[PDB]
Write an enzyme that holds these catalytic residues in place. Structure first.
Site, mmCIF file in Angstrom:
data_model
loop_
_atom_site.group_PDB
_atom_site.id
_atom_site.type_symbol
_atom_site.label_atom_id
_atom_site.label_comp_id
_atom_site.label_asym_id
_atom_site.label_seq_id
_atom_site.Cartn_x
_atom_site.Cartn_y
_atom_site.Cartn_z
ATOM 1 N N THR A 60 -53.259 33.356 -1.962
ATOM 2 C CA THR A 60 -53.216 34.768 -1.577
ATOM 3 C C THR A 60 -54.491 35.579 -2.083
ATOM 4 O O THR A 60 -54.837 36.609 -1.504
ATOM 5 C CB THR A 60 -52.174 35.506 -2.370
ATOM 6 O OG1 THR A 60 -52.112 35.077 -3.877
ATOM 7 C CG2 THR A 60 -50.778 34.771 -1.755
ATOM 8 N N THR A 61 -55.246 34.957 -3.336
ATOM 9 C CA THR A 61 -56.076 36.092 -3.947
ATOM 10 C C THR A 61 -57.510 35.840 -3.306
ATOM 11 O O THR A 61 -58.456 36.587 -3.464
ATOM 12 C CB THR A 61 -56.127 35.866 -5.446
ATOM 13 O OG1 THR A 61 -56.312 34.354 -5.662
ATOM 14 C CG2 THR A 61 -54.704 36.120 -5.793
ATOM 15 N N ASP A 87 -52.459 38.573 -9.265
ATOM 16 C CA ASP A 87 -51.985 38.560 -7.733
ATOM 17 C C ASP A 87 -52.002 39.960 -7.331
ATOM 18 O O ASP A 87 -51.014 40.725 -7.839
ATOM 19 C CB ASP A 87 -50.754 37.918 -7.507
ATOM 20 C CG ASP A 87 -50.369 37.918 -6.175
ATOM 21 O OD1 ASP A 87 -51.338 38.303 -5.194
ATOM 22 O OD2 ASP A 87 -49.186 37.440 -5.882
ATOM 23 N N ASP A 99 -49.074 24.393 -6.470
ATOM 24 C CA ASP A 99 -50.653 24.105 -6.555
ATOM 25 C C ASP A 99 -51.128 22.696 -6.920
ATOM 26 O O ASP A 99 -51.917 22.412 -6.328
ATOM 27 C CB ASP A 99 -51.117 25.184 -7.581
ATOM 28 C CG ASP A 99 -51.048 26.822 -6.891
ATOM 29 O OD1 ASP A 99 -50.823 26.874 -5.777
ATOM 30 O OD2 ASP A 99 -51.317 27.486 -7.867
#
Lengths: 513, 509, 513
Positions: C83-84, C50, C381
């Site tokens: 986010t990634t 991250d 997730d």
């Protein structure tokens, strides 16, 4: 902002790691040397052990953070080969770098390490055998465990005493020994000397000719709160704040003094008989001036300053229990070791509690006037105790002296990774990292780290030979026959701890300052 | 400051120490020593012969040098002879590595080399030990053995101290035939002559001594750092100097306070009341009339000297001394110790292990010199208690060793053949160091020492006859060594030399 | 004050950061992985996959990176992941478009391409988005385990599968509006420390760690009925404020204790009523809470009303002045499971709630207190799929063949859309294919030829469902390979990604304030 990325960024890492490990080549085995470490204390720290050196004083590196984990981990999981692990990983990196110097992906180089380790793991599972946990079979390992960590002459004089402690077990399942380590140390006329004592010894006693010099039936009353108080497992409050409170403070304390010493002397008569047995008072704090010679002349032996670690080992060793207090109580609660003997050596009074109901606690009295020696040898005992225990805990012992590393490198025979060629490099890089210990010894020995090593392999490839570089003359010999054996749990654990960090290396291509 | 990398710790920091090892011994050792100035944390000049002392006086940076310093004090305590020597041999020994480093030998190899060779040398020493002398009731026998033993660390009047330093250790123990660490106190008192140093058995307070004597016969001392000026540590009764009327009333009570003072002292009893603290006239004028002996404002050293020998604990606070807090002496008799009027106790039958020898030199460094020399005379008698086994003066022994070790070197083969043959060479630094001090070369000495081929007796001493460097039987010459003195010297020098060789660099940020 | 910035200069500064940020994590993201290791000025290493974790630990550059953390959050704010992805995806379109297109000179179709490149995703995805059974744990498990693996972790996947496969279905708001896609308060993951994987014990409803915190509290009453205040606690939060007195030292001590002795008398007022649970939003003090526990009355303290209300509906708890004083009781049971689990003597009260307002706060147990944190991320997730599958059964298989699927359908449509528009649309057609191609460049060989094979595969064979393997690099059906790329995720990714890059062009200027 400031970001180092990809291929050039990981260079400083592999430059550090490989650059940082190569200093430890002075270590790992008797042809290697104890490495001197100094700190802000100015303490000269002589260890051929990687962990000791590694976690104390070093140069700032990003890898310096990660390497501090593994030599700790291998010390944790074993107590041996902490110097070993370091030299493998950069040897693998130096290998790995070539392929990345070939441009071939650190990802493709990363993903080939793991099968190769498993291969060697499975192979070290193959070249292992279940050996004896026998003391002599442990000597075979103790000789070997100590030397690759501590010094050989130390190893030899340690080899018998190290095994004897871990042999004192009840058949514990512990890979390292908690209470088989009791370390007494002393300023001596021998900068290095270690006495082997089964049972617990006291930090300090108090020896009087009035007190019995020899207590054969020893009911040990081991107490924190001391003679100055009266029927108390807890200290009593002082008030020096005002005159009239302090005026009544110093008069009655002797009652707290008198009853306490009375608590023992009437209880010795109870517990130990009159003169019939010997009595043992332990004062973990100071001993009262009245009670000192009063407990003395009653047959009681009052012992000034036993630790809280003496407290717990005694209870475990002698099967009794340490008190906080001297009050009248049964003999069994009061610790009983079949001998309490206060052995005053140097200026230090060492009270043996011996013939212990559990020879779980066993003690080694270290000696030296010089602290750096007292540092070395006292440190030299532990690793083997942890190491050689991995021989006596485990029915299996892996053969040592690097004979097994030449053994896998060819047993890794290639296009066995016909898969891609990244694993084929992952094995090819890995086959060479195996040999760094067989290298570094023949290195640290005469001749060549290679010319012998290729002899070793050319030899080992010959049938019936599991053959290896001597830890001493560096010459080829079959290692399992010499008895030279590193602990079984080392290798399998070593390989994991070796590969992971080198694996972690290639997954970090970015560093941001 | 300390941590370095790049082979600075090994080929560099180590050898630099070996430089320090020279001329703390080289001219400062031999049958005689030589003096080297020492200026002090509070500045003043000390001349010194013996290694350990001046190097302890030197706060040393090199961890290399730092390690061997310890072994010399171990020697000096244990032995005292060759305390200079422990440097030179180890230095001459360690300097043999750099060439072996250019030759390419391994530390693991060469440590073993000197090791089995010093274990070989330790085997050879007993024979190069030549005859023996022990009589520990004989001052004159102990004198000559201590004479060269002090002489080795002393250039001075050798026999007189030898006499004196043999006088005490012989006469301080009725059981001599044993010796204990400190058996001789010295009250250093300047003036008169160097021969005015004199042996007096039993504690000397060099201090002013007051109180009118009630018993010179017995000395039982309640021992105090306590001020009897009226000042007790817990709550002080300190004189009030800021007012005339306050001092007027207190001094009238200082008579009677000192009364409550001298009594708690002499209740549990004292003949001398040993006073490390301050005393008041009204306390003394009473203590004079009360007739207890105040040895006043006593030196903490005199206090420590007393605190050690009588086995009693000085009381900073004023409080009745119990049997642990009171000392006992054979006699308290006010007498000049070296013609300096003080109180001198007697301890022979009392305990022993205290012979208070007034050291009177013309200067304090002479009074340090006579202080320096007996350090070995103390220990060599202790060695002489531990063995009478006698070795001639140094340099005769080491050649036979080299003769042994070199051929013992060719019987090595394997690279330690070099190392052992090197171990033979570190022996020859002494006759060199001796040839240095006397102003000649070892090579002639070496040639002469090998010429006769005797090996353990005939040697060049530290000599004016060294004008032309000249061998002599060291045994008969009175310049002498002992097995232990030679044995421990090799054992600790090689140890401290081989252990500093295994050390490596310190990685440090 | 007034500050002006202009032209490419800032937009190039926009290009730099996010793109440079897009480097390591694109290699990190997906099964092909690396690590971004921050160098602290002390040499401290922080390696994650991250970047937003790394970006914060050091200076965040204003032009690109200040908005990228927020579009990093926004994606992870929404679905609970990503986010990634958005950062490298926005970094893609940011990289090659503007300068090129601004050398072709226009801000407009650039911004306009994001739209029509965005919907071609929406267009080609939902066509090739493969539906999966939302009632089937497994048909959700294969898509959920694909999205539990976001970086390295398939480990807790199967275990984070089962909990989420159960939980998100039971998820309802306190409106209970729809199930399905949800706020993470209506599906909560609270990692519960200690234990072992066996205690993971799927929890479909809210948990109250404050329901039973003590062994002395209520013990396993199948339906806890939390009685709110209102009479059982009569209202006094105040203090007597008794007058000052200098005589008693206790008046200093007693006046502060008066605060918490009121609820004590209110807890005494509770005892008579015996509510099996008591909820107080004013909070109850512990000196007051003694007398509740001994009654076998557990106490939920310092919890708000909505915390209780959803639970009072979820645990089905009568909310009344007193149990004997009618406030019109709520139901006796809203839930079928009340499980109070104990790691240590701090009890964790879990009430499994079926289609209740609750929180759906799900129990997870790692082997210890630590790997919980990944299970929660795994579960989040995981629950993301379970909220996405219960939203979109159709979610695109791809190894980034989806990341091609748009890209090539774009160049197809670039031929259709034409104008000058096509050139941005054809330029932004390129940016999408890099992420997986990097992952199969992380693989090796010719990744553009694989991409050519991809493109050859693309319109010929299939866009995304049939596709390239991400970690292997083979062209395979990604449902057949089992790699699932959630529609919403992908739907969110470019959307979130195209949005930020629109403004990054729109900003040539920042001021100082």
């Amino acid at each position: 902002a400031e970001v180092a990325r990809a291929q050039a960024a990981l260079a400083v890492n592999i430059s550090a790691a490989r650059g940082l490990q190569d200093v430890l080549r002075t270590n790992l085995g008797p042809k290697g040397t104890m490495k001197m470490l100094v700190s802000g204390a100015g303490d000269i720290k002589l260890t051929k052990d990687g962990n000791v050196l590694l976690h104390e004083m070093q140069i700032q590196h990003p890898t310096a953070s990660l390497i501090a984990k593994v030599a700790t981990a291998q010390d944790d999981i074993t107590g041996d080969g902490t110097t070993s692990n370091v030299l493998i990983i950069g040897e693998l990196l130096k290998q790995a770098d070539l392929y990345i110097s070939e441009g071939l992906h650190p990802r493709i180089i990363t993903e080939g390490f793991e099968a190769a380790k498993e291969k060697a793991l499975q192979f070290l599972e193959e070249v292992k055998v279940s050996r004896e946990m026998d003391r002599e079979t442990l000597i075979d390992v103790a000789r070997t465990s100590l030397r690759t960590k501590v010094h050989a002459e130390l190893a030899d004089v340690l080899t018998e005493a190290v095994v004897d402690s871990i042999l004192a077990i009840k058949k514990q399942d512990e890979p390292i020994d908690l209470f088989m380590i009791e370390i007494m140390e002393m300023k001596h006329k021998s900068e290095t000397d270690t006495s082997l004592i089964r049972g617990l010894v006291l930090d300090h006693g108090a020896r009087h000719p009035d007190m019995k010099k020899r207590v054969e039936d020893a009911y040990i009353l081991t107490c924190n709160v001391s003679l100055e108080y009266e029927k108390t497992e807890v200290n009593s409050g002082f008030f020096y704040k005002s005159a009239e409170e302090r005026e009544k403070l110093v008069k009655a304390e002797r009652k707290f003094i008198e009853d306490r010493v009375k608590k023992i002397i009437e209880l010795k008569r109870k517990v130990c008989g009159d003169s019939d047995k010997g009595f043992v008072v332990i004062n973990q704090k100071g001993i009262d001036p009245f009670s000192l010679d009063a407990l003395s002349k009653e047959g009681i032996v009052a012992l000034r300053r036993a630790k809280r670690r003496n407290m717990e080992r005694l209870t475990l060793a002698c099967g009794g229990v340490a008190l906080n207090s001297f009050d009248d109580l049964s003999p069994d609660c009061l610790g009983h070791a079949g001998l309490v003997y206060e052995y005053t050596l140097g200026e230090e009074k060492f009270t043996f509690i011996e013939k212990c109901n559990n020879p779980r606690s066993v003690t080694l009295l270290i000696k030296g006037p010089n602290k750096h020696t007292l540092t070395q040898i006292k440190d030299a005992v532990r690793d083997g105790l942890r190491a050689v225990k991995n021989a006596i805990d485990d029915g299996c012992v892996v053969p040592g002296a690097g004979a097994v590393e030449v053994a896998m490198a060819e047993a890794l025979i290639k296009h066995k990774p016909s898969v891609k060629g990244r694993a084929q490099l992952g094995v090819q890089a890995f086959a060479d990292a195996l040999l760094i210990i067989p290298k570094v010894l023949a290195q640290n020995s005469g001749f060549d780290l290679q010319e012998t090593l290729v002899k070793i392999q050319a030899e080992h490839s010959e049938s019936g030979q599991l053959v290896g570089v001597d830890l001493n003359t560096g010459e080829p010999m079959v290692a399992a026959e010499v008895g030279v054996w590193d602990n079984y749990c080392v290798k399998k654990q070593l390989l994991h701890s070796c590969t992971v960090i080198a694996t972690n290396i290639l997954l970090v291509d970015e560093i941001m300052r | 400051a300390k941590h370095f990398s790049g082979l600075e710790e090994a080929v560099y920091r180590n050898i630099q120490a070996c430089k320090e090892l020279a001329q703390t011994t080289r001219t400062a050792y031999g049958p005689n020593g030589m003096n080297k100035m020492v200026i002090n944390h509070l500045e003043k000049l000390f001349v010194t012969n013996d290694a350990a002392t001046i190097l302890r006086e030197l706060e040393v940076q090199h961890p290399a040098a730092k390690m061997i310093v310890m072994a010399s004090h171990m020697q000096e305590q244990e032995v005292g002879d060759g305390t200079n020597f422990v440097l030179v041999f180890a230095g001459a020994l360690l300097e043999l590595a750099e060439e072996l480093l250019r030759i390419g030998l391994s530390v693991s190899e060469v440590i073993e080399g000197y090791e089995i060779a010093c274990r070989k040398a330790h085997e050879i020493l007993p024979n190069l030990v030549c005859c023996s002398a022990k009589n520990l009731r004989d001052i004159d026998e102990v004198s000559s053995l201590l004479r060269t033993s002090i002489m080795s660390k002393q250039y001075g009047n050798e026999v007189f101290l030898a006499k004196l330093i043999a006088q005490a250790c012989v006469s301080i123990f009725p059981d001599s035939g044993h010796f204990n660490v400190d058996n001789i106190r010295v009250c250093k008192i300047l003036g008169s002559g160097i021969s005015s140093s004199s042996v007096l058995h039993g504690m000397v307070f060099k201090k002013e001594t007051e109180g009118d004597v009630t018993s010179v016969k017995d000395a039982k001392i309640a021992v105090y750092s306590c001020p009897f000026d009226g000042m007790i540590t817990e709550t002080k009764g300190t004189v009030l100097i800021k007012t005339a009327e306050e001092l007027m009333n207190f001094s009238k009570g200082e008579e009677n306070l000192m009364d409550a003072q001298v009594k708690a002292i002499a209740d549990t009893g004292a003949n001398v009341v040993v006073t490390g603290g301050k005393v008041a006239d009204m306390a003394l004028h009473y203590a004079n009339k009360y007739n207890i002996m105040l040895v006043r404002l006593n030196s903490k050293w005199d206090l420590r000297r007393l605190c050690k020998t009588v086995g009693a604990t000085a009381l900073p606070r004023l409080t009745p001394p119990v049997l642990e807090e009171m000392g006992h002496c054979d006699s308290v008799y006010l007498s000049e110790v070296g013609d300096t009027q003080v109180v001198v106790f007697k301890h022979e039958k009392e305990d022993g292990a205290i012979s208070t020898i007034v050291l009177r030199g013309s200067t304090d460094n002479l009074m340090d010199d006579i202080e320096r020399a007996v350090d070995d005379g103390v220990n060599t008698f202790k060695v002489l208690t531990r063995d009478k086994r006698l070795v001639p003066g140094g340099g005769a022994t080491e050649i036979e060793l080299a003769k042994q070790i070199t051929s013992y070197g060719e019987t090595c083969p394997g690279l330690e053949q070099y190392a052992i043959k090197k171990f033979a060479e570190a022996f020859e630094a002494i006759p060199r160091a001796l040839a240095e001090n006397s102003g000649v070369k070892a090579n002639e000495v070496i040639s002469k020492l090998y010429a006769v081929h005797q090996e353990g007796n005939k040697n060049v001493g530290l000599d004016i006859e060294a004008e032309v460097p000249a061998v002599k039987d060291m045994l008969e010459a009175g310049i002498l060594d002992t097995y232990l003195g030679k044995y421990w010297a090799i054992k600790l020098a090689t140890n401290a030399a081989v252990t500093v060789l295994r050390v490596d660099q310190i990685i440090m940020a | 004050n007034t500050k002006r910035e202009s032209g490419r200069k800032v937009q190039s500064g926009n290009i730099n950061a996010a793109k440079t940020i897009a480097d390591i994590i694109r290699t990190c993201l997906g099964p092909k992985s690396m690590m971004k290791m921050l160098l602290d000025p002390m040499g401290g290493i922080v390696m994650t996959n991250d970047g937003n974790a790394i970006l914060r630990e050091i200076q965040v550059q204003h032009p690109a990176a200040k908005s990228m953390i927020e579009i990093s959050r926004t994606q992870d704010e929404e679905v609970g992941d990503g986010t990634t992805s958005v950062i490298i995806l926005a970094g893609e379109m940011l990289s090659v478009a503007e300068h090129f297109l601004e050398q072709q000179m226009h801000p407009t179709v650039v911004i306009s391409a994001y739209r029509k490149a965005l919907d071609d995703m929406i267009s080609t995805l939902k066509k090739i988005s493969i539906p999966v059974d939302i009632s089937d744990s497994d048909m959700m498990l294969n898509i959920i385990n694909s999205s539990i693996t976001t970086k390295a972790i398939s480990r807790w996947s199967s275990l984070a599968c089962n909990i989420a496969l159960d939980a998100v279905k039971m998820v309802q708001f306190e409106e209970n509006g729809r199930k399905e896609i949800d706020i993470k308060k209506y599906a909560r993951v609270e990692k519960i420390p200690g234990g072992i994987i066996e205690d993971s014990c799927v929890l479909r409803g809210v948990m109250i760690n404050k329901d039973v915190t003590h062994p002395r509290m209520r013990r396993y009453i199948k339906n806890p009925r939390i009685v709110l205040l209102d009479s059982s606690l009569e209202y006094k939060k105040g203090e007597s404020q008794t007058d000052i007195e200098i005589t008693r030292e206790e008046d200093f001590t007693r006046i502060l204790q008066m605060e918490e002795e009121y609820i004590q008398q209110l807890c005494e007022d509770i005892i008579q009523l015996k509510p099996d649970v008591v909820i107080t939003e004013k909070g109850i003090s512990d000196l007051a809470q003694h007398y509740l526990m001994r009654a076998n009355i557990t106490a939920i303290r310092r919890v708000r009303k909505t915390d209780n209300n959803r639970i009072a509906r979820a645990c089905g708890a009568r909310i009344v002045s007193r149990p004997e004083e009618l406030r019109e009781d709520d139901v006796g049971t809203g839930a079928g499971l009340l499980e109070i689990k104990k790691i240590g003597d701090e009890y964790f009260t879990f009430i499994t709630d079926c289609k209740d307002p609750k929180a759906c706060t799900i129990l997870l147990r790692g082997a210890s207190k630590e790997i919980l944190s990944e299970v929660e991320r795994n579960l989040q997730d995981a629950m993301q799929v379970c909220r996405n599958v219960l939203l979109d059964p159709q979610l695109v298989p791809g190894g980034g063949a989806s990341e091609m699927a748009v890209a090539h359908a774009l160049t197809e449509k670039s031929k259709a859309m034409t104008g000058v528009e096509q050139w941005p649309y054809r330029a932004v057609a390129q940016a999408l294919e890099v992420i997986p191609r990097t992952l199969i460049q992380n693989c090796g060989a010719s990744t553009i030829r694989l991409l050519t094979s991809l493109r050859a595969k693309h319109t010929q064979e299939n866009c995304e469902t049939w596709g390239v393997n991400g970690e292997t690099g083979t062209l395979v059906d990604m449902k057949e390979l089992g790699i699932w790329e959630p529609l919403a995720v992908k739907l969110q990714t470019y959307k979130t990604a195209v949005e930020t890059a629109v403004l990054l062009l729109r900003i040539d200027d920042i001021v100082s304030g």
